[PDB]
Amino acid sequence: MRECISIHVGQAGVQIGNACWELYCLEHGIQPDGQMPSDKTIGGGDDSFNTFFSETGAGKHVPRAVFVDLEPTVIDEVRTGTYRQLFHPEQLITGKEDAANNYARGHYTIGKEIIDLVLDRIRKLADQCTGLQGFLVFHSFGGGTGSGFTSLLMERLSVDYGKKSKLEFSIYPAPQVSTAVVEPYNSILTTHTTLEHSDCAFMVDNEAIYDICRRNLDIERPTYTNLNRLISQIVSSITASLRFDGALNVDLTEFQTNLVPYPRIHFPLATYAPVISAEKAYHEQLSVAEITNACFEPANQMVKCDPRHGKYMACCLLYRGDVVPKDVNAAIATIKTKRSIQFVDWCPTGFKVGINYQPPTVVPGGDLAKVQRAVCMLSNTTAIAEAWARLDHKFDLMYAKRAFVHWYVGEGMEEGEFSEAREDMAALEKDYEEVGVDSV
Amino acid sequence: MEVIELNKCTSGQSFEVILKPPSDPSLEEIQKKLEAAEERRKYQEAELLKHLAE
Amino acid sequence: MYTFVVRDENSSVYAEVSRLLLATGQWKRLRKDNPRFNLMLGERNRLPFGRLGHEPGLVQLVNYYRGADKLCRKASLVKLIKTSPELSESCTWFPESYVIYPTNLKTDEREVFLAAYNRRREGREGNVWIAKSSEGILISSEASELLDFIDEQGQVHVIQKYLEKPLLLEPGHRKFDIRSWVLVDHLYNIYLYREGVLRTSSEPYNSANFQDKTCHLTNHCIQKEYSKNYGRYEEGNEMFFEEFNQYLMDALNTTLENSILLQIKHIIRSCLMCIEPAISTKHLHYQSFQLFGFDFMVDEELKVWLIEVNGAPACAQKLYAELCQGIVDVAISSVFPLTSIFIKLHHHHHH
Amino acid sequence: REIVHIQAGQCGNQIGAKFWEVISDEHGIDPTGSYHGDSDLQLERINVYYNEATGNKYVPRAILVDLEPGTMDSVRSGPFGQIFRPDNFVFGQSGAGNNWAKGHYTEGAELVDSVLDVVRKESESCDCLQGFQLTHSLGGGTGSGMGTLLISKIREEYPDRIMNTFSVMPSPKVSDTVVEPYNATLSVHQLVENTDETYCIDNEALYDICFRTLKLTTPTYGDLNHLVSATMSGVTTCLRFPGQLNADLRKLAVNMVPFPRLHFFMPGFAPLTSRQYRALTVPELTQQMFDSKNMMAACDPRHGRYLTVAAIFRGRMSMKEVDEQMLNVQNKNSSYFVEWIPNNVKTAVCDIPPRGLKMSATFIGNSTAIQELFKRISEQFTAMFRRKAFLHWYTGEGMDEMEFTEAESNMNDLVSEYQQYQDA
Numbered sequence A: 001m002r003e004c005i006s007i008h009v010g011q012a013g014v015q016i017g018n019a020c021w022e023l024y025c026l027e028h029g030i031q032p033d034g035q036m037p038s039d040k041t042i043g044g045g046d047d048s049f050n051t052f053f054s055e056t057g058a059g060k061h062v063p064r065a066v067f068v069d070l071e072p073t074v075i076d077e078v079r080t081g082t083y084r085q086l087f088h089p090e091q092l093i094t095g096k097e098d099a100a101n102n103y104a105r106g107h108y109t110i111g112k113e114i115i116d117l118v119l120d121r122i123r124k125l126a127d128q129c130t131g132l133q134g135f136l137v138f139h140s141f142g143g144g145t146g147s148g149f150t151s152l153l154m155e156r157l158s159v160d161y162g163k164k165s166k167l168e169f170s171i172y173p174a175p176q177v178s179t180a181v182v183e184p185y186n187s188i189l190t191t192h193t194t195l196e197h198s199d200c201a202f203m204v205d206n207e208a209i210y211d212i213c214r215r216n217l218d219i220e221r222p223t224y225t226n227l228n229r230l231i232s233q234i235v236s237s238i239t240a241s242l243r244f245d246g247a248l249n250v251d252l253t254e255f256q257t258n259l260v261p262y263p264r265i266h267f268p269l270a271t272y273a274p275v276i277s278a279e280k281a282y283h284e285q286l287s288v289a290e291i292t293n294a295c296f297e298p299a300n301q302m303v304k305c306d307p308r309h310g311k312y313m314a315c316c317l318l319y320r321g322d323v324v325p326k327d328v329n330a331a332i333a334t335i336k337t338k339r340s341i342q343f344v345d346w347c348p349t350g351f352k353v354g355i356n357y358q359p360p361t362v363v364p365g366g367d368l369a370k371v372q373r374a375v376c377m378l379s380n381t382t383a384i385a386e387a388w389a390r391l392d393h394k395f396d397l398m399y400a401k402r403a404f405v406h407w408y409v410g411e412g413m414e415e416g417e418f419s420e421a422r423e424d425m426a427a428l429e430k431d432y433e434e435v436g437v438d439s440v
Numbered sequence B: 001m002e003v004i005e006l007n008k009c010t011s012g013q014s015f016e017v018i019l020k021p022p023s024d025p026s027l028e029e030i031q032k033k034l035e036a037a038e039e040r041r042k043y044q045e046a047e048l049l050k051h052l053a054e
Numbered sequence C: 001m002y003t004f005v006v007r008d009e010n011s012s013v014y015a016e017v018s019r020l021l022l023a024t025g026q027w028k029r030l031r032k033d034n035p036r037f038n039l040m041l042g043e044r045n046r047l048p049f050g051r052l053g054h055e056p057g058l059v060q061l062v063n064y065y066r067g068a069d070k071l072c073r074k075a076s077l078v079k080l081i082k083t084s085p086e087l088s089e090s091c092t093w094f095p096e097s098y099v100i101y102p103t104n105l106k107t108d109e110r111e112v113f114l115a116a117y118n119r120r121r122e123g124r125e126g127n128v129w130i131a132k133s134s135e136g137i138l139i140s141s142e143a144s145e146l147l148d149f150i151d152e153q154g155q156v157h158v159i160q161k162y163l164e165k166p167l168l169l170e171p172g173h174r175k176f177d178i179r180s181w182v183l184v185d186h187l188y189n190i191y192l193y194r195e196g197v198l199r200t201s202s203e204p205y206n207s208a209n210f211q212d213k214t215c216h217l218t219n220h221c222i223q224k225e226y227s228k229n230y231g232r233y234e235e236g237n238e239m240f241f242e243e244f245n246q247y248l249m250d251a252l253n254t255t256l257e258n259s260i261l262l263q264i265k266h267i268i269r270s271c272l273m274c275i276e277p278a279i280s281t282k283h284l285h286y287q288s289f290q291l292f293g294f295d296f297m298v299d300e301e302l303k304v305w306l307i308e309v310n311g312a313p314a315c316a317q318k319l320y321a322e323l324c325q326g327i328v329d330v331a332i333s334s335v336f337p338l339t340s341i342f343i344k345l346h347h348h349h350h351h
Numbered sequence D: 001r002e003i004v005h006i007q008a009g010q011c012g013n014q015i016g017a018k019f020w021e022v023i024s025d026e027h028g029i030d031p032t033g034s035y036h037g038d039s040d041l042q043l044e045r046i047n048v049y050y051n052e053a054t055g056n057k058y059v060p061r062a063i064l065v066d067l068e069p070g071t072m073d074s075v076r077s078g079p080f081g082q083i084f085r086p087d088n089f090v091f092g093q094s095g096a097g098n099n100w101a102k103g104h105y106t107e108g109a110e111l112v113d114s115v116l117d118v119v120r121k122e123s124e125s126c127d128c129l130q131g132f133q134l135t136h137s138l139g140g141g142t143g144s145g146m147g148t149l150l151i152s153k154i155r156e157e158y159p160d161r162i163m164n165t166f167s168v169m170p171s172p173k174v175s176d177t178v179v180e181p182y183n184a185t186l187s188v189h190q191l192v193e194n195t196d197e198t199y200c201i202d203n204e205a206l207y208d209i210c211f212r213t214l215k216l217t218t219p220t221y222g223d224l225n226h227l228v229s230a231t232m233s234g235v236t237t238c239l240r241f242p243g244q245l246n247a248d249l250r251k252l253a254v255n256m257v258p259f260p261r262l263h264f265f266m267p268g269f270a271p272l273t274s275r276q277y278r279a280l281t282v283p284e285l286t287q288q289m290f291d292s293k294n295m296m297a298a299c300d301p302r303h304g305r306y307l308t309v310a311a312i313f314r315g316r317m318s319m320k321e322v323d324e325q326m327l328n329v330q331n332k333n334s335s336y337f338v339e340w341i342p343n344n345v346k347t348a349v350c351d352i353p354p355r356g357l358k359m360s361a362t363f364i365g366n367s368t369a370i371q372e373l374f375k376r377i378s379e380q381f382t383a384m385f386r387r388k389a390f391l392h393w394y395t396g397e398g399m400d401e402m403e404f405t406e407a408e409s410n411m412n413d414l415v416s417e418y419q420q421y422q423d424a
């Protein structure tokens, strides 16, 4: 058994972290005060759930988590909320002035004065770890903390823990939800500074999650908690193989081996089916074939784009519920005949499959109906580069007039970091186009 | 369509199906970058306080 | 008030649809790079499909199908036909065709190609070929010469069977090709425009010297220039369907629909239904339509051959008005509301 | 969190007083500072504008400044006069005679340090001060001249807080003296340099609204100030009520101000109210709030382009309908928003409506059309300055013509900078 520390930065990372840990507790049968009746070896262990929870002599099961916000109001609601008991006060870290949607303010100005405190609170968790594999980092692209502080954190984690893997869960900005006009700047800036410190990153476009809640959950104006419980299901699908017995994606390094052959192109597309409303009176349960097929509709992807006009490098299916291998291969067979699924020449056209027999657990009073089988697909397709094209184009429009630039320079950032970051992104877009398109 | 390295346990199964075969900077470099920005800030503040003194 | 932007100004047909849309009084043109449009009439190359369908509160529609270029480039079409099971190696309406990469670039069929050539040489069959790509065309029965010529130009070229016995219209003993305009809407309805055209040669067809290429190449450009008899029999070297129908009735005792059109509608249907899973926008966050130009040849036994599909066609001058009104009707106002000039191509045989 | 409010001069104090009257009545706090509402949302951000007192009375974090005692005696006598901390009344005795120079250089200098002492004692009492707001006019002497002197001193002592002003622009239609274009031009230069966001309230626009659409035939300063209270309440909604959006000026400034000197916002309000019963639909709120006739700055939005926009809807309504209506002015008038700032319109909503309305909308536009306000002030200025007319009132207090020439150059620059981005 090897432990994993989750790091939640900014509002988006904290409120999503709350969503995840709520779900993890429901899944492992841990209650809000940290007690796990089914855990029969009291005060210690090395089961697979122990990679995420640690144990105290009194029988409390404690997330291997640090929450970090440069302003207190969001983590205060953790400290006062229904899971107050579960986290040690030392794992909730607040500033008092936030980064005002400004990458430079979170990285340089407010970053410098809190980075050492965070690294030592991170180190207090790493010290109760007999074997650490590395980190899960939750953050928004568009926030000033989520973007600027995270990239500073990511740089130093590489130094202080250079043999450990670092995975991110990144909220990509979407005007239907988004908080700010400068979020394209913050996104490009922090992707450029984090690109080499991140081994594999799962992007969630707030636009895709929003529309899934409107169309499939009949929520006409989705809240953050709507958005986050759905994001939480998908994250828990992705992490279940670290918390549960199995042989696929058993540690963080397998995530890069299985999903990232080229290390810069480390943005797997997540697709998830089915999302069913709990208010749906009469619902016909969907089959293995139907939910595997739903993995290839764009309307179910965490990032709207079109995988038909790209190439795959890797592909996992993670099933939860009543699924058996024979039905997967029958579903896969029928799908490859009816759909454009082309791989890059230097990879096998194939699927790594993982099944866990316990179906998704749903938060009581949530918006998701309980289902008998679900699947989350993780496909490293070059079509995700569409999201970089979108982001980069918005960045180009504003920076051509230096709009808002003065806010960043005023924090001590130099204008040239903008153009460096944007040139890195220019490379990244061409890497994607090299791998994933052949000549016109 | 080959179905390979099947693994079972009470929690679930895992395997691999193949349809077709193939055809970092320093700590000191970081806190220097952080201090160079801090001085660019403290300079622009001194330029303001000098202007306000004029 | 719907909104639209124009990003191909060198487009005869969408120039006219732009003006037809303004005249409605319900469409406003924005500037090229304004993102708040309902409709994009976009560029031919590098059209930024990845940026469509992400504007909250805006149904967006573009006049091109992403991926539809695998039908409209000569090398791709060949590769599509022989690799797709619905079209087949065993495809009766496509001329034998082989992709050939030049020597500088070093898949490629060139040695599978002359298998067919020498099987024809010692088979004593007529064996003229034609080399082409996506003006630099050579028609010769010396295989030894055509792989000569492909490699001194630097682009990938396809070599295709030459149709040595084409149907020839009299008076003239002269070649032609047929161009049909088909519209695929956002619902993937396939609409054939009821008017086609015959792009005539006005030179009698000479089967003994293919090095002169003006009785062999029916392109409106080459006839406008090289041929001494441009404008001789038909206005603009363009024959329309009413004439070509009655010529077939008088000269050959059939009609256009029975002799040729059934075969054309079968080829259009088969090509677009093949690539439909790859380009459909049915469940996508933006929508596509596209106007295509299909080009056919008729041999003397009245068999129709597909020679190429063009994804950005110009229209014939007389027809611009009616086709372009038709595009607005069924491609644009179908999505943005304010007897048909199209034949819907649908067939569902049971087996 | 906490904001320190400052109101300077005759106009700054009258509008300031009715602002505090209006928002104190929203938050349930009565004239003696005693709370008496029925919801806890009235109290959740009450600290942004109020200190909690002995007996948990609520006292405005407000300093009242004048160079004469007339108007502030009127405030102490006024409806909510006793709400204010009496130590926060700072006044001289001789007035400023509608003279910028007296406000900024002579009479004002004598009293500015005693104002800064009360500022300091109000910031030290602040858990985490985020910045200041000043209400003043630019056409007189105290609020114009001393007000901008105070803004300069406050920046010196707090260079990293947000400075925010509600600035009444002078108009010949509502005019106290001929020298207003001089006082306004001197003040605008200070504002370009030393504030993060300035709400341009044009007495011209407040008059025309009062006349053309409220059909008040003889508008008083009281009628003008009703409009000013209503839109000040509206723009400060996020600072005072719980919402998705936190109560901080810095995020607003960052998202509204693409270039630092272009921070002069055109405010707007709907429905336009004089001191009725019809339900206003969400499509109507939206159409009006963007209507030129609802702008408090007498500029025509269709003469310029919106760099950024913030909009604040108040009441019980469907934010799906709000979302739809906002998306449909931007998508049906995309001409008038710069294409080089994507998604430059932000919309916020608050459940609690203002007194007397079930639904209101407040508009905050950073339009390049605001140049028209500055060119108007500039033409009036030049018409006197080319004859050095009325200058003696200023050279008498130490000023030189050079300082006028510099101030008019700076405003003409500001107008050119607006025009550069209306063509970009």
Ligand SMILES: Nc1nc2c(ncn2[C@@H]2O[C@H](COP(=O)(O)OP(=O)(O)OP(=O)(O)O)[C@@H](O)[C@H]2O)c(=O)[nH]1
Pocket: A009, A010, A011, A012, A013, A015, A016, A070, A071, A098, A099, A100, A101, A102, A106, A139, A140, A141, A142, A143, A144, A145, A146, A147, A171, A172, A173, A174, A177, A178, A179, A180, A183, A206, A224, A227, A228, A231
């Ligand atoms: N899915 C989801 N997105 C969020 C959430 N909170 C914010 N976002 C999005 O993240 C971006 C804003 O970033 P934040 O995380 O709030 O910024 P921050 O990290 O708190 O940084 P500062 O507040 O600027 O110090 C916007 O695009 C939001 O739509 C959340 O809880 N769930």
Ligand SMILES: Nc1ncnc2c1ncn2[C@@H]1O[C@H](COP(=O)(O)OP(=O)(O)CP(=O)(O)O)[C@@H](O)[C@H]1O
Pocket: C095, C130, C132, C160, C161, C162, C163, C164, C175, C176, C177, C216, C217, C218, C219, C295, C297, C307, C308, C310
């Ligand atoms: N295998 C073949 N057999 C007989 N004739 C052929 C032929 N291939 C091409 N042609 C003739 O050459 C002419 C044009 O060839 P090509 O397919 O390259 O069209 P093109 O792209 O150059 C102009 P457009 O796009 O308008 O059709 C045809 O009209 C036809 O007369």
Ligand SMILES: COc1cc(-c2ccnc3cc(-c4ccc(C)cc4)nn23)cc(OC)c1OC
Pocket: A179, A180, A181, D235, D236, D237, D238, D239, D245, D246, D247, D248, D249, D251, D252, D255, D256, D308, D309, D310, D311, D312, D343, D344, D345, D346, D347, D348, D364
């Ligand atoms: C919307 O009105 C208000 C908004 C805010 C606020 C809080 C936190 N983040 C943000 C982002 C933006 C924004 C503004 C414009 C654009 C184009 C994009 C984004 N505004 N904003 C504060 C407020 O208090 C004073 C407020 O009232 C005026």
Ligand SMILES: Nc1nc2c(ncn2[C@@H]2O[C@H](COP(=O)(O)OP(=O)(O)O)[C@@H](O)[C@H]2O)c(=O)[nH]1
Pocket: D008, D009, D010, D011, D012, D014, D015, D096, D097, D098, D099, D137, D138, D139, D140, D141, D142, D143, D144, D168, D169, D170, D171, D174, D175, D176, D180, D203, D206, D221, D222, D224, D225, D228
């Ligand atoms: N809307 C409004 N404008 C005012 C008011 N009082 C003065 N003004 C304007 O303010 C200018 C004179 O400023 P004033 O406040 O009397 O000067 P000060 O007291 O010396 O700062 C002129 O433009 C007046 O029209 C008021 O109460 N409401």
Ligand SMILES: [Ca+2]
Pocket: A039, A040, A041, A042, A043, A044, A045, A046, A055
């Ligand atoms: Ca245990």
Ligand SMILES: [Ca+2]
Pocket: A158, A162, A164, A196, A197, A198
């Ligand atoms: Ca590393």
Ligand SMILES: [Ca+2]
Pocket: D110
């Ligand atoms: Ca004196």
Ligand SMILES: [Cl-]
Pocket: A160, A161, A162, A163, A164
């Ligand atoms: Cl290490």
Ligand SMILES: [Mg+2]
Pocket: A010, A011, A069, A071, A098, A143, A145
């Ligand atoms: Mg925050």
Ligand SMILES: [Mg+2]
Pocket: C134, C308, C310
């Ligand atoms: Mg062509």
Ligand SMILES: [Mg+2]
Pocket: D010, D140, D176
């Ligand atoms: Mg006065």
Ligand SMILES: [Mg+2]
Pocket: D113
């Ligand atoms: Mg003193």
